């Protein structure tokens, strides 16, 4: 265990964030919506993070008519609770026993469906990462595991490459053995951090190949290719401009559809947002407008925000 | 003329490599405005 | 102190938003009758509290050291005359949390010489389908206020949200609160009266699938659905001699409510609460609550039945722990049809946590005993009503943990019935309840 | 079929564990390869 | 464990009940008596109650009939199938009670679909049959004859639409609320409580009309005239197109009524088509305001009003 220290192997990121830059930062699929949306976010404290958010939406079905969320976060705890109409409750609780070990629990209640609980444990070593998440644990009369178990390991062979595997075991009812799936993950980061590449091979032959590039501090791009006999393929290109006044995002798919999403900050509190997707081949177009307004709960932060 | 799943996989891979080449080319760098 | 001091002269700053002829009444009636220094200090405190209550200033500063005869200095903070947008959350008693958005606007003195305020509120919630509220407040006097409310709200009421209630209308209310009590009632007891007149159009629908169950389809509940318009007069008296509203440690509180629908019905309700602490650091607290209510039908020959929403209901996590909501009283088939007379009592005891690591926290151990009765009395005699209201009660006991935060009260209890009826909705074991009002 | 599926799942998980061990020992193998070349 | 010992004591069910409610349900219920003699041979679990909009007492036979064609058709079908006899007055005229079928006046808000008639069956195990269920039950008894099914579907699509449009538009609120509302009335404003009943009709008149346009896919057949009722503009663009729609319905319904006179021969027990024709005739000849449909059926269709009276004599003793 001496040449390992001499090589100075760096700790790789989480297995779930191999293509995080492309999936979240670049592409606007996650942040796209339809109809009219208004958000009111009020913050009560800074060093202990604590805030609430009221969401009022109309003109669309994906966004609920009204929603209320409240989150708190101290140095080593995170607790978020959200309530949506028709009595849908979601709660996330993350605790870090140490800088390496993190335990998280997600509990959702639908008031008419069985309560769903997911427990995840993550460990970040000096040069490898191990995560294990369990969904709906159960034991039968034979003492056998029942539920969903996902165990992923990732190790960086060199400070530029990272290889890992993910194993899924899914037993639903317990009468029959669950299915097992193995996925291979590979990640490469350039020396200059200019561009990164990611690849994933699933158990069913599905392929994911993503590339992320950062031209400057205000311009990023990404390209994704997904594949799955009966197989289907998709190619997506996305571009993001991050400016001090506004944020622009555009995306185009190989099927001939395009989408745009802009966030314009005109006031220190109010910030408008527009989004639009057009598919000329299939004749399907969706639109969405929204606004975000921020307030300070206590007088100290109110004065700080006012100036 | 193939019209096969392997053919469409190869076509998607060709699209991906063409996009990667475009990104690596100075055209993508010039696509970014100065500001 | 007993130094003879007269007051002549008030230097006001930041009072350009209020008419001097209006501020003079406040100043006179609160501070320009003092004859000694202690009275002057008490009157200054009363004036500050009153100006905070009437939304004349968000913060008031007072100076007395200036010099028998002396001149007092008053400083206001100029509350925002412009628009005020707010968002908020409220705790309904029946395990429902409501959210609301509110817009406030103060009217300039050149239009109305009386301090006036207008707010518009949009509210949603667990059972509240929707609510639109328009409130207008006017400070007619330093010890009197007038409110005009226009409301339109739709929600679900009964068990499993079986019913659907929609109300539209308007009410006008006048609240009177004396500045000083008359020597009988170093404390600040609260006392106020409120007189209101309301008109409302209400629609009741059975929002329950007939294939689901035979619930909400009894003979009584089928004849309740429909539309009705009504007008009611009402009076409310509150006297609160307690040191805190949400965390009492000593003292008593009394509430009295009267409602009259002319030629239709007359309702009276009374509630008494008493709290006493015994140990060195409020370790053991004993709270006793007793509520009574009586409803009479003024219609001729027992015509014009009283609606199900105007009758009393007993049972629930808040009212009587150990039973389900709408879980007491007579039933037609499986539905609680309310009652005309009711009595309820609670005998709670609170203890602090013995662990000195966590002992100043609001979390406390709780032992409670509850009970009561709800009857449909014959309209003949109060004697018969009391005779049939004093036998075969429905009691319960339990132990649990309570968190009495000033914002809200949370309780997690293990409850066990002691007496009940055959058809009562018993709730044994663990029960959770959050809100503001508990027995 | 049933027990056959159980055995197949066990074989897949054992192969996954073997590949995990191979990945764990991979950095030293690649360091030795680089030293040789 | 020990939970079974709690409650420590248990009393009988509380038997006190409100008497102002028992009188309300007694003036809104009408009892179906048996054909030949006796009271009945039924238990409380075998009786049913028919929920209808309202009730009117006809001049000729004096029986109590529902004010809606569908409710009256269901009432006649139930009387025919079980051999019952039409009521004559509310149960407040007969304080003594026994186990009989009955007809109950209910608000349309007494079920999620906001429609009547409904059927309530059983006491301790209670079943609610809605309007759609009643319609599908009634429509499955005429599938044997394929020609009678064509006539049956013509009555409740053309004539039904004409009746609904006329009653909603060409008649005043005072006439609509007399047929499709359970609210009380006296006809003379004397007491201060009669002023309060007059404002409720004005306020809730339009809300009851919107609920009536959803009973038989009326809102789907006529989409552009049920959206003009849900707004306050009174524009003349939607006021000219409306009278064109209401004019083709009346012209089509005259053909239906003139063609029905040619087949009105009942050789014994009436079929479901004769009962449905009689229901429409009896409900049209009840309206007081001079609507065009009533004028037509009273001036040009004197042979259709005698058939309805002849078919009604089979159910009143």
């Amino acid at each position: 265990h001496s040449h390992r220290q001499s090589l100075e192997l760096v700790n790789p990121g989480t297995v779930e964030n191999l293509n995080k830059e492309v999936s979240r930062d670049v592409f606007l699929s996650q942040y796209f919506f339809t109809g009219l949306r208004a958000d009111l976010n009020k913050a009560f404290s800074m060093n202990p993070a604590f805030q609430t958010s009221h969401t009022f939406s109309i003109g669309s079905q994906a966004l609920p008519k009204y929603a209320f969320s409240a989150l708190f976060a101290n140095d080593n705890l995170f607790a978020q609770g959200n309530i949506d109409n028709d009595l849908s409750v979601s709660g996330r609780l993350n605790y870090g026993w140490d800088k390496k070990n993190i335990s998280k629990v997600n509990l959702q209640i639908s008031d008419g469906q069985p309560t769903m609980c997911q427990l995840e444990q993550d460990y970040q070593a000096s040069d490898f990462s191990v995560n294990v998440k369990t969904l709906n644990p159960s034991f039968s009369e034979k003492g056998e595991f029942t539920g969903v178990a996902v165990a992923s390991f990732l190790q960086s062979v060199t400070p530029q490459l990272a290889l890992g595997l993910e194993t899924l075991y899914s037993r639903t009812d317990g009468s029959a053995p669950g299915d097992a799936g193995v996925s291979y993950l590979t990640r490469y980061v350039s020396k200059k951090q200019d561009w990164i590449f990611s690849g994933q091979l699933q158990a069913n032959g599905a392929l994911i190949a993503s590339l992320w590039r950062k031209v400057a501090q205000n311009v990023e791009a990404g390209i994704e290719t997904t594949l799955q006999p009966t197989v289907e393929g998709s190619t997506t290109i996305g571009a993001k401009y991050e400016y001090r006044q506004s944020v622009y995002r555009g995306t185009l798919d190989s099927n001939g559809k395009v989408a745009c999403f802009l966030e314009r900050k005109v006031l220190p509190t109010l910030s408008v947002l527009f989004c639009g997707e057009i598919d000329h081949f299939k004749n399907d177009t969706k639109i969405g407008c929204g606004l975000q307004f921020e307030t300070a709960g206590n007088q100290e932060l109110l004065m700080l925000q006012q100036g | 003329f193939k019209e096969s799943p392997l053919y469409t996989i190869a076509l998607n891979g060709a699209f991906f490599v063409a996009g990667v080449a475009f990104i690596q080319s100075p055209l993508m760098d010039m696509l970014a405005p100065q500001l | 102190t007993l130094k003879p001091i007269r007051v002549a002269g008030v230097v006001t700053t930041g009072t350009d938003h209020i008419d001097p002829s209006v501020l003079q009444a406040y100043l006179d009636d609160t501070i320009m009758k003092s004859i000694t220094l202690g009275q002057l200090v008490k009157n200054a405190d009363v004036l500050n509290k009153r100006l905070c209550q009437h939304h004349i200033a968000l913060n008031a500063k007072q100076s007395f050291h200036f010099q028998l005869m002396e001149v007092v200095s008053q400083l206001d903070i100029l509350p925002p005359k412009t628009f005020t947008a707010k968002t908020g959350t409220n705790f309904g008693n029946d395990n429902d949390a409501e959210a609301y958005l509110q817009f406030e606007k103060l009217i300039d003195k050149k239009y109305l010489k009386l301090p006036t305020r207008v707010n518009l509120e949009i509210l949603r919630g667990t059972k509240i389908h929707s609510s639109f509220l328009f409130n207008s407040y006017s400070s007619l006097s330093p010890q009197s206020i007038l409110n005009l409310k226009v409301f339109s709200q739709f929600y679900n009421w009964n068990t499993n949200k079986g019913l659907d209630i929609g109300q539209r209308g308007a009410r006008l209310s006048l609240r009177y609160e004396p500045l000083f009590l008359h020597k009988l009632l170093n404390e600040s007891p609260t006392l106020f009266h409120e007189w209101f007149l309301e008109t409302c159009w209400r629609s009741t629908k059975i929002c329950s699938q007939g294939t689901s169950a035979p619930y909400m389809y009894s003979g009584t509940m089928l004849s309740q659905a429909g539309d009705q318009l009504r007008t009611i007069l009402g009076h409310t008296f509150v006297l609160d001699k307690r040191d805190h509203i949400m965390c009492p440690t000593k003292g008593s509180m009394l509430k009295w409510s009267n409602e009259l629908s002319p030629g239709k019905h007359l309702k009276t309700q009374l509630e008494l609460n008493s709290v006493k602490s015994w140990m060195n650091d409020d370790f053991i607290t004993f709270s006793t609550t007793i509520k009574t209510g009586y409803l009479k039908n003024l219609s001729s020959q027992q015509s014009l039945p009283v609606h199900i929403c105007d009758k009393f209901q007993s049972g629930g996590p808040s009212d009587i722990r150990g039973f389900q909501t709408f879980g007491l009283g007579p039933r037609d088939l499986y539905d609680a049809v309310g009652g005309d007379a009711f009595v309820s009592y609670g005998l709670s005891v609170f203890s602090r946590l013995p662990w000195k690591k966590v002992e100043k926290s609001n979390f406390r151990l709780h032992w409670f005993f509850n009970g009561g009765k709800l009857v449909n009395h014959d309209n003949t005699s109060l004697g018969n009503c009391i005779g049939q209201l004093s036998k075969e009660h429905s009691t319960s006991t339990g132990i649990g943990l309570v968190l009495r935060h000033p914002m809200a009260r949370f309780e997690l209890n293990f409850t066990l019935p002691i007496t009940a009826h055959e058809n009562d909705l018993i709730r044994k074991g663990f029960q959770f309840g959050l809100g503001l009002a508990f027995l | 079929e049933k027990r056959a599926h159980q055995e197949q799942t066990e074989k897949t998980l054992k192969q996954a564990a073997y590949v995990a061990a191979f990945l764990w020992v991979s950095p030293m193998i690649w360091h030795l390869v680089k030293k040789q070349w | 464990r020990i939970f079974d010992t709690f409650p420590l004591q248990t009393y009988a069910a509380q038997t006190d009940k409100d008497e102002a409610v028992a009188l309300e349900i007694q003036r809104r219920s009408y009892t179906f008596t048996e054909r030949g003699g006796g009271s009945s041979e039924l238990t409380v679990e075998g009786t049913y109650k028919l929920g209808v909009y309202n009730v009117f007492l006809e001049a000729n036979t004096g029986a109590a009939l529902a004010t809606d064609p569908w409710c009256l058709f269901v009432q006649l079908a139930l009387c025919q199938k079980n051999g019952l006899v039409l009521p004559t007055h509310s149960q407040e005229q007969t304080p003594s009670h026994t186990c009989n079928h009955e007809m109950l006046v209910l608000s349309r808000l007494s079920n999620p679909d906001e429609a009547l008639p409904i059927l309530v069956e059983g006491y301790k195990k209670r079943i609610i049959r809605s309007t759609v269920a009643i319609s599908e039950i009634m429509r499955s008894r005429i599938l044997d004859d394929a020609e009678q099914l064509m006539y049956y579907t013509l009555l409740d699509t053309v004539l039904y639409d004409c009746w609904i449009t006329q009653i909603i538009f060409c008649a005043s609120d005072a006439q609509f609320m007399e047929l499709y509302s359970c609210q009380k009335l006296s006809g003379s404003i004397v007491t201060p409580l009669d002023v309060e009943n007059s404002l409720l009709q004005k306020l809730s008149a339009k809300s009851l009309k919107i609920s009536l346009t959803k009973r038989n896919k009326f809102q789907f057949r006529h989409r552009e005239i049920v959206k003009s009722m849900q707004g306050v503009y009174h524009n003349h663009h939607n006021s000219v197109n409306q009278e064109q729609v209401l004019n083709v319905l009346f012209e089509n319904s005259k053909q239906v009524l003139l063609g029905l006179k040619d087949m009105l021969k009942s050789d014994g027990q009436p079929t479901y088509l004769h009962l449905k024709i009689a229901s429409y005739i009896l409900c049209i000849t009840n309206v007081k305001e001079p609507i065009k449909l009533k004028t037509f059926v009273e001036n040009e269709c004197k042979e259709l009003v005698q058939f309805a009276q002849d078919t009604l004599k089979n159910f009143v003793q």
Partner: protein
């Protein structure tokens, strides 16, 4: 009778979207006798393709030069049949008018509902054929709302009758669930269609079978629309096996004969600007609706 008839269509043919425009051009082209020709003489066919002229939002509309608007195939033919001087397509006798009206109304309210299901609620037909026609029928800004409106309408009439990566793989079972649901739905539709058309055939035999009535042009129009869709082979197989190859072939031969007719009686007219339905007229109508 002098007026104008507005229908769904393009360049002299009626689109498969509307089964009442297809049956209304087989009507005017079958009025050849002396009595029948005077019924439709004076009418002008316009393929306006804008619903703002309709009195109830449905496109086949007759306007008699003075504001009198009659909408719908059944209403139009019933209005025309009562304006006969009385001095191929046959005119039914007085003793058989109620039955003819009953059959026509039954087709309109029962069998014309099933065609909407195949046109909009059937995914294989909607995603492949239905949506492509609107882009050619309407103008560019008004290209996307009409298909969604018609799809939403077509499911309101048929409700009670017919109604990381491993996580993605788990969600992929939705496709199999959808396939099972589609297989389930194809069984209710077949039974309902078999019952409706069997009832119509049983009732139709009471009339004369040697003539062509107004109610035959609508049933055959529904069959023509339903058997020309991409998924029409399954329907053709299901109907044939339970109603007879000879009967199905006779109906198809009648449909083909109706399709291959000379357009002599028919006389088109190019739409005028006030009845175009372009962006300017759409904005004018939107302004007038609110005012």
């Amino acid at each position: 009778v002098k007026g104008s008839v507005h229908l769904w269509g393009k360049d002299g043919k009626a689109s498969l979207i509307s089964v009442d425009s297809i049956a209304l051009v087989w009507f005017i082209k079958l009025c050849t006798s002396e009595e029948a020709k005077s019924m439709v003489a004076g009418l002008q066919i316009v393929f306006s393709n804008n619903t703002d002229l309709s009195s109830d939002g449905k496109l086949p509309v007759l306007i008699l030069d003075n504001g009198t608007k009659v909408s719908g195939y059944v209403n139009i033919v019933q209005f025309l049949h009562k304006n006969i001087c009385t001095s191929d397509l046959a005119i039914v006798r007085k003793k058989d008018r109620l039955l003819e009206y009953s059959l026509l109304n039954y087709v309109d309210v029962e069998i014309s509902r099933l065609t909407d299901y195949q046109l909009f609620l059937n995914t294989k037909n909607y995603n492949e054929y239905t949506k492509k026609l609107f882009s050619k029928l309407l103008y560019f800004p008004m290209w996307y709302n009409t298909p969604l409106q018609l799809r939403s309408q077509a499911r309101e009439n048929c409700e009670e009758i017919i109604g990381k990566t491993f996580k993605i793989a788990h969600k992929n079972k939705i496709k199999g669930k959808q396939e099972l649901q589609q297989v389930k739905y194809n069984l209710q539709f077949d039974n309902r269609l078999q019952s409706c058309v069997s009832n119509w055939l049983a009732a139709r035999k009471k009339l004369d079978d040697s003539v062509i009535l107004s109610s035959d042009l609508l049933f055959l129009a529904n069959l023509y629309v339903q058997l020309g869709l991409p998924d029409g082979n399954r329907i053709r197989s299901k109907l044939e096996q339970t109603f007879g190859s000879e009967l199905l072939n006779s109906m198809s031969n009648k449909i083909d004969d109706f399709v291959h007719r000379p357009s002599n009686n028919l006389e088109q007219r190019d739409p005028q600007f006030r009845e175009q339905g372009n962006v300017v007229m759409s904005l004018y109508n939107l302004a007038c609706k609110y005012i």
